């Protein structure tokens, strides 16, 4: 019954085409509730969930201010990291940042995160103790030394333990009808002669699911879980069989693991 709140930031430099493109997206479990886009006209943080729209305008002012501050920080860090790696000004580079907190069923803090990336590879991450940093290369050791000399991990730990957890509790209470739901999969099996058997799992929330194929009780194509577009998720698994097979589905909403056989 644990819950999480995550924030994802992407900043891509566009040399010769203006300022870097900045995207900020907030998540509670698998549901997105806020979004900021630098290319949008409003230039404000915007709701993406119905339960977050009940917040006052001062909340959105504060969110817009903080997200624009983060955008400026990433904009400066793009040039700093271009200097670190001896990269030219012609190419485009990406900085990705993710942070958040984990909460339990009791509402108590479990885990805090902050991971940064440069060009799709790890750059620097906070350790599980929320006190030390892990650097991936020599350019990241400069950042690690700067952040240790600035005691940045202390402020980050304060945010992760205190502010993130309380606001996650508030969001979970505001969206208790949606965030605390668990939809069992709508499960069915299909047969197509080549032959193959496809085990469908549709309309389940959250996105964590396990589909396993067993031949007489022994484990053996599997597509990744994909969004249905309406707050639910879909997945299927396939097995090629000659002209005795069972598919097993495990989900939070399902009381017991299903055991599906053809026909």
């Amino acid at each position: 019954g644990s819950h999480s709140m995550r924030y994802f930031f992407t900043s891509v430099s566009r040399p010769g085409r203006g300022e870097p493109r900045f995207i900020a997206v907030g998540y509670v479990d698998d549901t997105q509730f806020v979004r900021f886009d630098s290319d949008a006209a409003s230039q404000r943080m915007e709701p993406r969930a119905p339960w977050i729209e009940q917040e006052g305008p001062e909340y959105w002012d504060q969110e817009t201010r903080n997200v624009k501050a983060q955008s400026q920080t990433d904009r400066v860090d793009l040039g700093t990291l271009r200097g670190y790696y001896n990269q030219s000004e012609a190419g485009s580079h990406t900085i990705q940042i993710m942070y958040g907190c984990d909460v339990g069923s009791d509402g108590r803090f479990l885990r805090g995160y902050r991971q940064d990336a440069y060009d799709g590879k790890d750059y620097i991450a906070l350790n599980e103790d929320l006190r030390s940093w892990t650097a991936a290369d020599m350019a990241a050791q400069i950042t690690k030394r700067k952040w240790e000399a600035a005691h940045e991990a202390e402020q980050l730990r304060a945010y992760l333990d205190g502010t993130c957890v309380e606001w996650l509790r508030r969001y979970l209470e505001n969206g208790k009808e949606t965030l605390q739901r668990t939809d069992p999969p709508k499960t069915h099996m299909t047969h197509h002669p080549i032959a193959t058997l496809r085990c469908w799992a549709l309309g389940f929330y959250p996105a964590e699911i396990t589909l396993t194929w067993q031949r007489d009780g022994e484990d053996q194509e599997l597509v990744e879980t994909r969004p249905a577009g309406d707050g639910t998720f879909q997945k299927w698994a396939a097995v090629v069989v000659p002209s005795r097979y069972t598919c097993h589905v495990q989900h939070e909403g399902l009381p017991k693991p299903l055991t599906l056989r053809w026909e």
Partner: antibody, heavy 118, light 107 residues
């Protein structure tokens, strides 16, 4: 009626300290961040300090950095400005302001005069 | 630090004329964080426009705000005798910054 009331202003010797207060009424003072704005006679408005609704974030103008302290106590609905090492340049009318927002809520005080001279 | 440059410094106009006021920001701002104020020579400033285009409660229709990014404008289509005052543009994205103030006076 949404109202802001200033007190604690007056004449102060150069180099001494002084504290200003804002009493808030008619609105949920604890929900919003508050500003201090000063205006020297015959001059424009100059933002001094801001405190967030919970008091975690405090920012100051470069002219008053390290000398002015801003604080709130949400129980009595009061905003505080503590001014130390006051110079003659600090002579102005000081306003506590509930404003600077996108939804159009703007509440000013009546203004308290601080005069710094020998 | 965001610097708000307000131009011109003085508007010498006759009542019944059009007043155009300009504000320059040192960096691009979200339009929702720009406001205009009016101050009479003896009292606190009064908000006229918020969000760079939205009139406050009980503000006459002659006051109108426009602009985006770094350029913003305040227009008074018809100058009433009570409109002759000092006007300030203000940003609230990062702390608060007021413009120098444009004084509207009688020609």
């Amino acid at each position: 009626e949404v109202q802001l009331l200033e007190s604690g202003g007056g004449v102060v010797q150069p180099g001494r300290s002084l504290r200003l207060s804002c009493a808030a009424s008619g609105f949920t003072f604890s929900s919003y961040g508050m500003h201090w704005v000063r205006q020297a006679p015959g001059k424009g408005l100059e933002w001094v300090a801001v405190i967030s609704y919970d008091g975690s974030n405090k920012y100051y103008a470069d002219s008053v950095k390290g000398r002015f302290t801003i604080s709130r106590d949400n129980s009595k609905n009061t905003l505080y400005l503590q001014m130390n090492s006051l110079r003659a340049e600090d002579t102005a009318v000081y306003y506590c302001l509930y404003g600077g927002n996108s939804y159009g809520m703007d509440v000013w005080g009546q203004g308290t005069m601080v005069t710094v001279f020998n | 630090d965001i610097v708000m440059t307000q131009s011109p410094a003085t508007l010498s106009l006759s009542p019944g004329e059009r007043a155009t006021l300009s504000c320059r920001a040192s960096q691009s701002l979200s339009s929702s964080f720009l406001a205009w104020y009016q101050q009479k020579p003896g009292q606190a400033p009064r908000l006229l426009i918020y969000g760079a285009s939205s009139r406050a409660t009980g503000i006459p229709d002659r006051f109108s705000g426009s602009g985006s990014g770094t350029d913003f404008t305040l227009t008074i289509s018809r100058l009433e005798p009570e409109d002759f005052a000092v006007y300030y543009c203000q940003q609230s994205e990062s702390a608060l910054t007021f413009g120098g103030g444009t004084k509207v006076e009688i020609k």
